Amino acid sequence: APPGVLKIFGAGLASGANYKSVLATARSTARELVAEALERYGLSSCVDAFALCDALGRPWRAEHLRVLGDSERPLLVQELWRARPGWARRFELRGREEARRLEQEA
C-alpha cells in the first residue's frame, strides 16, 4: 500500500552510479517507472528498448532475473514476493534485449 520508494539499480549505464530511486504508488506501472528511471539516468519512445527487472542472486552479479511486463505494478511485485533464503533481490534497469537473454539462460 504505502507510497514507497524503489531503488532501480543501474548495473552499468553511467560509470559510478550504483542506483537511482523513484517514487512508486500501488498503481504505478512498470513502463511509467522505466520512463522516470531513464530520465534520472539521462537518456521519443526510447522506453521500449529498456526493461525493468526483478533480479536475484547470492551476495554482486544477478544469478536470475525476470522482465516485468509494462502493465505490472512494481511496488506490489516487491511487496508481495521475496527471494528464497540466502538470496538478495533488487530492481535493475537493463536494455530489453540483454534482459530477455538473461531471463532465458542463467
Binding site: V5, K20, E39
Partner: protein, 167 residues
C-alpha cells in the same frame, strides 16, 4: 580496500547532486530535478591506499523523507551542504547537525561543513566568517567553501571525510 559510507546531506537546491556527479563522473549537471535517493560508487586513492566510497546523494524534500533515520545510522562520514546564495539553507543546518549527533550519539562523528556555489560571489548571503565560526562552534569542525561548477574543493570534500574516518 576499505569501504567508506559517505552521505551528502542538506536542504534542497544547495548543490548536493552537483558536488557528487562532479566528483564521480567528472561533469557538471545542467537542470535541477529533485533527488529521492541516489547512490554512487567510485574508487580513488587517499594516502598511498586505494579506497572504495559509496556516496549517498540524498533528498532536499525533508517532509517526503523519513528515510533520513536509516542513512544517518548507516553512514560513516557526512558532508552538510549549504548554498551561500540562500540563508535558509545555512540556517536549516544546525537542525541536521544535531540529528546526526543524536542518532550516532556522539560529537566525535567524521564530518565536513560545506558552503557550495562559491563561484557566485555576487549573490552571496552567508559570509565566510559566518561559515568558519559555525565550524568552531561545531566542536571545531572541518570547513570549506566549494564550487561544483569551478571544481573548487570538490575532491577535497570527499578525501577529508575518508581521512577523518581513518581510526
Amino acid at each position: 580496500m576499505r569501504e567508506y559510507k559517505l552521505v551528502v546531506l542538506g536542504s534542497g537546491g544547495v548543490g548536493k547532486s552537483a558536488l557528487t556527479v562532479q566528483f564521480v563522473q567528472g561533469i557538471f549537471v545542467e537542470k535541477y530535478d529533485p533527488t529521492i535517493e541516489d547512490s554512487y560508487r567510485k574508487q580513488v586513492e587517499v594516502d598511498a591506499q586505494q579506497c572504495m566510497l559509496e556516496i549517498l546523494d540524498t533528498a532536499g524534500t525533508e517532509q517526503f523523507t523519513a528515510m533520513r533515520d536509516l542513512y544517518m545510522k548507516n553512514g560513516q562520514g557526512f558532508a552538510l551542504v549549504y548554498s551561500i546564495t540562500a540563508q535558509s539553507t545555512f540556517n536549516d543546518l544546525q537542525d541536521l547537525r544535531e540529528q546526526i549527533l543524536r542518532v550516532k550519539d556522539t560529537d566525535d562523528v567524521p564530518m565536513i561543513l560545506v558552503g557550495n556555489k562559491c563561484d557566485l560571489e555576487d549573490e552571496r548571503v552567508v559570509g565566510k566568517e559566518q561559515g568558519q565560526n559555525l565550524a568552531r562552534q561545531w566542536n571545531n569542525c572541518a570547513f570549506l567553501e566549494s564550487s561544483a561548477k569551478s571544481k573548487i574543493n570538490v575532491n577535497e570534500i570527499f578525501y577529508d571525510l575518508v581521512r577523518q574516518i581513518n581510526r
